[PDB]
Design an enzyme around this catalytic site. Sequence first.
Site, short mmCIF file in Angstrom:
data_model
loop_
_atom_site.label_atom_id
_atom_site.label_comp_id
_atom_site.label_asym_id
_atom_site.label_seq_id
_atom_site.Cartn_x
_atom_site.Cartn_y
_atom_site.Cartn_z
N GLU A 35 -6.87 -4.52 -29.61
CA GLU A 35 -7.33 -5.75 -29.00
C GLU A 35 -8.50 -6.36 -29.77
O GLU A 35 -8.52 -7.58 -30.00
CB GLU A 35 -7.75 -5.51 -27.54
CG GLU A 35 -6.61 -5.22 -26.57
CD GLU A 35 -5.74 -6.44 -26.26
OE1 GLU A 35 -6.05 -7.56 -26.74
OE2 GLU A 35 -4.74 -6.27 -25.54
N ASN A 46 -6.43 -18.42 -26.05
CA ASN A 46 -5.00 -18.41 -25.73
C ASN A 46 -4.43 -19.82 -25.74
O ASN A 46 -5.16 -20.82 -25.70
CB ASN A 46 -4.78 -17.76 -24.37
CG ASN A 46 -5.36 -16.38 -24.29
OD1 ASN A 46 -5.09 -15.54 -25.15
ND2 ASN A 46 -6.17 -16.13 -23.26
N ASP A 48 -2.92 -21.49 -23.45
CA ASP A 48 -3.16 -22.28 -22.25
C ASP A 48 -4.61 -22.75 -22.11
O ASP A 48 -4.97 -23.31 -21.07
CB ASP A 48 -2.73 -21.49 -21.00
CG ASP A 48 -3.62 -20.29 -20.70
OD1 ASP A 48 -4.55 -19.98 -21.49
OD2 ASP A 48 -3.41 -19.66 -19.64
N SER A 50 -7.30 -20.74 -22.15
CA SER A 50 -8.17 -19.65 -21.76
C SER A 50 -8.60 -18.83 -22.99
O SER A 50 -8.04 -18.97 -24.08
CB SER A 50 -7.48 -18.76 -20.72
OG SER A 50 -6.33 -18.15 -21.28
N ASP A 52 -10.07 -14.86 -24.47
CA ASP A 52 -10.20 -13.42 -24.28
C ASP A 52 -11.52 -12.95 -24.87
O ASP A 52 -11.89 -13.37 -25.97
CB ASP A 52 -9.05 -12.69 -24.97
CG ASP A 52 -7.70 -13.16 -24.48
OD1 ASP A 52 -7.56 -13.39 -23.25
OD2 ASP A 52 -6.80 -13.33 -25.32
N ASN A 59 -9.54 -11.75 -20.07
CA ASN A 59 -9.09 -13.14 -20.10
C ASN A 59 -9.83 -13.99 -19.06
O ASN A 59 -9.98 -13.57 -17.91
CB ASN A 59 -7.58 -13.18 -19.84
CG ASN A 59 -6.94 -14.47 -20.23
OD1 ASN A 59 -7.59 -15.51 -20.31
ND2 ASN A 59 -5.63 -14.43 -20.46
N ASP A 101 -4.35 -3.75 -10.61
CA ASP A 101 -3.74 -4.92 -9.98
C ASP A 101 -2.23 -4.79 -9.78
O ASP A 101 -1.61 -5.74 -9.30
CB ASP A 101 -4.06 -6.20 -10.78
CG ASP A 101 -3.20 -6.37 -12.05
OD1 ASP A 101 -2.42 -5.47 -12.42
OD2 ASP A 101 -3.32 -7.44 -12.69
#
Length: 129
Positions: A35, A46, A48, A50, A52, A59, A101
């Site tokens: 990562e 990203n 969209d 957003s 990281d 995110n 989650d």
Amino acid sequence: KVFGRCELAAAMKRHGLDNYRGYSLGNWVCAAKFESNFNTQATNRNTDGSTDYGILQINSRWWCNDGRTPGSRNLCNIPCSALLSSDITASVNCAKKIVSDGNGMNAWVAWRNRCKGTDVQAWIRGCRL
Ligand code: NA
């Protein structure tokens, strides 16, 4: 801060990630490696809009507030910049909420594509843990 491999493993173990939700320590080190290359200051945007953040590339769409991701959530209740600190406490505590989650570590695309199904224990071989 750029962490060493065993330095990160020891810090992750101290913060309770070893076998958290059943994921052995080697999973977390492999994920951080692919990562962020063990760099706490890593950021990536990203498609969209957003971004990281940090050693585990958490995110801003769901987990932190960076002031530039409209319509997003802040489920770890932190500014995203807190995830760039040399102290990984905020990253590890937020990562514990993500992995809980329901999707496990499949939440991290690098883990699923580069760690899952490999010998992740090799990532802690040689460390005093
Ligand atoms: Na957010």
